[PDB]
Amino acid sequence: MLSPADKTNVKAAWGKVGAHAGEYGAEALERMFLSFPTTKTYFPHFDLSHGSAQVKGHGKKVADALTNAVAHVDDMPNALSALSDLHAHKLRVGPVNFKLLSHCLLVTLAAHLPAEFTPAVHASLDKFLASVSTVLTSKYR
Amino acid sequence: MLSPADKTNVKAAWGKVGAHAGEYGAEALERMFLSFPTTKTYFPHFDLSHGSAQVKGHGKKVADALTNAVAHVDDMPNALSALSDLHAHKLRVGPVNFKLLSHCLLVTLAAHLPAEFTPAVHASLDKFLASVSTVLTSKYR
Amino acid sequence: VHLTPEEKSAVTALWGKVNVDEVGGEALGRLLVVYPWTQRFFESFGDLSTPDAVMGNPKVKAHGKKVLGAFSDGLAHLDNLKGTFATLSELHCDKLHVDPENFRLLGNVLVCVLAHHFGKEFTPPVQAAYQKVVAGVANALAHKYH
Amino acid sequence: VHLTPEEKSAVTALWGKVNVDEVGGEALGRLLVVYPWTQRFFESFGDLSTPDAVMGNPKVKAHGKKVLGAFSDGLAHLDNLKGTFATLSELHCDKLHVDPENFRLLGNVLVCVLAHHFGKEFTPPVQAAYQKVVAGVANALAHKYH
Numbered sequence: 105m106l107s108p109a110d111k112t113n114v115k116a117a118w119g120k121v122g123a124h125a126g127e128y129g130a131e132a133l134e135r136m137f138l139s140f141p142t143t144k145t146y147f148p149h150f151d152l153s154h155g156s157a158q159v160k161g162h163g164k165k166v167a168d169a170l171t172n173a174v175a176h177v178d179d180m181p182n183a184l185s186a187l188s189d190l191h192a193h194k195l196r197v198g199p200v201n202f203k204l205l206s207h208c209l210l211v212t213l214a215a216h217l218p219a220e221f222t223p224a225v226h227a228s229l230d231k232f233l234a235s236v237s238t239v240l241t242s243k244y245r
Numbered sequence: 246m247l248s249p250a251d252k253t254n255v256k257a258a259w260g261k262v263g264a265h266a267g268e269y270g271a272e273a274l275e276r277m278f279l280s281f282p283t284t285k286t287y288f289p290h291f292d293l294s295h296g297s298a299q300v301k302g303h304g305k306k307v308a309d310a311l312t313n314a315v316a317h318v319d320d321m322p323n324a325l326s327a328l329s330d331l332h333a334h335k336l337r338v339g340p341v342n343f344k345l346l347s348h349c350l351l352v353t354l355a356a357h358l359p360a361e362f363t364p365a366v367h368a369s370l371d372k373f374l375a376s377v378s379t380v381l382t383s384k385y386r
Numbered sequence: 387v388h389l390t391p392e393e394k395s396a397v398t399a400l401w402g403k404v405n406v407d408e409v410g411g412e413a414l415g416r417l418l419v420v421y422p423w424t425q426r427f428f429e430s431f432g433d434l435s436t437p438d439a440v441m442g443n444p445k446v447k448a449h450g451k452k453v454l455g456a457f458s459d460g461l462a463h464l465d466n467l468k469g470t471f472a473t474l475s476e477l478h479c480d481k482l483h484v485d486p487e488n489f490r491l492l493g494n495v496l497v498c499v500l501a502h503h504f505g506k507e508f509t510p511p512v513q514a515a516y517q518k519v520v521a522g523v524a525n526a527l528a529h530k531y532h
Numbered sequence: 533v534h535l536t537p538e539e540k541s542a543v544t545a546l547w548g549k550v551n552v553d554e555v556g557g558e559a560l561g562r563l564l565v566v567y568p569w570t571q572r573f574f575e576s577f578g579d580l581s582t583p584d585a586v587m588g589n590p591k592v593k594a595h596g597k598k599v600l601g602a603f604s605d606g607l608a609h610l611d612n613l614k615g616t617f618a619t620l621s622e623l624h625c626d627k628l629h630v631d632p633e634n635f636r637l638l639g640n641v642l643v644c645v646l647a648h649h650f651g652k653e654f655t656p657p658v659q660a661a662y663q664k665v666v667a668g669v670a671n672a673l674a675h676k677y678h
């Protein structure tokens with residue numbers, strides 16, 4: 105459950121991401137593929153090579169949805185219903201993977217927002233990605 | 246979330262547990278200690294010997310709490326608030342351990358309820374235990 | 387795996403009593419039913435719409451017997467699982483693209499199934515030996531992923 | 533662990549740039565902040581009521597450097613983290629009652645801190661190699677639990 109500080113923290117942090125969210129999306133994916141090679145099992149149809157247009161493109165998509173969730177930090181369940189749908193009934197990504205992308209997203213933010221990645225912001229972002237994770241895997245069964 | 250189907254399954258199977266809940270709780274703890282030894286770090290103060298009265302006593306407590314969740318299947322978050330508070334603030338059990346207990350609780354029931362432990366009841370019991378776990382871990386941060 | 391001799395004997399005694407045909411079908415069906423997401427890999431198997439549809443699907447039963455067949459083989463080479471499972475590991479990764487976490491879920495389902503089948507015979511300590519074993523196999527099956 | 537000479541070099545060289553004092557105090561405090569239940573082992577440290585209070589607690593800071601210290605000494609034995617951490621593993625089990633899962637959390641926290649610190653330098657390929665080491669260390673530390 106995101107506290108008022110958390111939502112603030114999250115909103116602040118993502119605010120700085122700005123025009124780079126897409127790039128950060130892409131980079132996180134890249135870090136996940138490299139660090140947790142099992143995650144690649146879900147993208148057999150992509151070119152996973154460095155700077156592949158497929159990864160870039162996809163990075164954008166992930167970034168944009170994250171953005172959308174920060175904006176509806178208050179109504180996540182509702183803001184991401186379609187996405188919860190897609191993942192649960194179409195994609196069928198196993199739940200463990202959500203923790204892997206989440207972690208890689210922290211790492212990426214850490215690496216690019218030195219000043220804003222304080223211990224309190226770190227905790228908030230973590231809880232946020234966890235919340236996003238829960239929403240996205242809530243219609244699994 | 247638990248469907249009406251799930252609720253019927255759980256009340257039915259737990260119904261059968263009846264007066265053995267105590268012994269089954271103790272048993273689930275023993276299996277957990279033997280298979281996932283890392284869980285013992287939380288019970289340094291216990292005689293974990295075979296047939297420890299401590300374990301027996303502890304098993305009833307757990308079973309009693311599960312019985313209480315079944316009794317309030319439509320208000321678990323409130324029926325369990327106290328225990329959520331306890332596990333989050335005093336015991337501070339790391340999340341992953343909950344899934345270890347759930348799994349051994351599942352093993353015990355299977356071993357004792359051959360007739361009721363159908364694929365459908367198994368799925369329902371799994372979702373139930375996952376929800377209980379979610380509640381007990383809700384106040385962690 | 388870290389199997390004491392007495393764990394190894396207990397694994398083997400019990401396994402002697404198992405009907406791989408049936409246990410196999412039961413474990414695989416139960417997996418598709420308890421963790422519906424694992425159905426992604428068997429869209430060509432047909433109707434998996436309800437529990438009766440999965441448990442009784444001749445394709446699920448057949449596959450399950452295949453999987454458990456490969457598993458029993460593993461049980462005879464408990465000394466060299468990585469070895470035993472190498473080609474299968476490569477297949478699951480490279481051709482099938484099966485997320486290796488699926489192998490641990492199957493492990494757990496199987497332990498419930500053995501509990502289901504042997505009742506009291508599946509003692510606390512017999513389960514601890516099987517836990518080691520299914521963990522070993524899942525590791526072996528994931529060893530070749532890249 | 534199962535590091536490629538190339539991956540061995542990247543770990544080795546980034547590390548050489550690490551101020552153990554700072555990174556250690558920060559890895560440990562971020563842990564207590566992000567995963568509040570880890571505080572159950574540091575009751576005696578004092579006020580951990582706030583990010584500010586953990587980050588500031590010198591007991592925390594000094595524990596952090598003692599932790600990174602041993603971690604540091606372990607990168608010198610990447611071929612045998614098991615024998616390197618055996619006594620520390622027994623200690624953590626038998627005396628401290630620390631759940632090995634915490635080893636993994638720390639590891640991840642550690643990787644976040646290095647990224648935090650090295651920005652650009654901490655590339656996907658460099659993170660990949662560190663992920664294998666933190667896993668490796670966590671595994672060696674949990675190795676003697678019974």
Ligand code: HEM
Pocket residue numbers: 143146147162165166169170187195197201202203205206236237240
């Ligand atoms: C941080 C949580 C996640 C978010 C917000 C997210 C978001 C998205 C979005 C926005 C799309 C595109 C939907 C469309 O095309 O309209 C997508 C598709 C997809 N996602 Fe997720 N995702 C998340 C986690 C994951 C994880 C952990 C995996 C696998 C390890 C995954 C696997 C996939 C796949 C395979 C696709 C389709 C790829 C394609 O064929 O283009 N997602 N996701």
Ligand code: HEM
Pocket residue numbers: 284287288290306307310311328331332336338342343344346377378381
């Ligand atoms: C669904 C799972 C769980 C349920 C229903 C449950 C329930 C309970 C209950 C009813 C108590 C007794 C509190 C009192 O004195 O009134 C308790 C205590 C305790 N639980 Fe849990 N718990 C669960 C999971 C866990 C797990 C997974 C662990 C660790 C592996 C754990 C560790 C403890 C400890 C250490 C105590 C205190 C023991 C003592 O000193 O008497 N619990 N739990």
Ligand code: HEM
Pocket residue numbers: 424427428452453454456457474477478482484488489492523527
């Ligand atoms: C104990 C773990 C497992 C073992 C020993 C095992 C063994 C096998 C064997 C022997 C085959 C046939 C190989 C061939 O076609 O050349 C196979 C195929 C397959 N396995 Fe696995 N398997 C295991 C777990 C799983 C799990 C958990 C999944 C998915 C959740 C899975 C998915 C598949 C699929 C999709 C196929 C091919 C089916 C087809 O013919 O279309 N396996 N497995």
Ligand code: HEM
Pocket residue numbers: 570573574598599600602603620624628630634635638669673
């Ligand atoms: C990379 C992983 C870790 C390493 C290398 C490590 C290493 C050490 C070392 C070298 C000591 C010195 C104590 C002595 O020699 O008596 C120590 C103590 C201790 N560690 Fe760990 N540790 C690790 C992770 C953890 C984690 C994650 C926790 C808890 C979240 C933890 C809890 C403790 C505690 C409570 C002590 C005792 C401190 C005291 O006496 O006040 N350790 N550890």
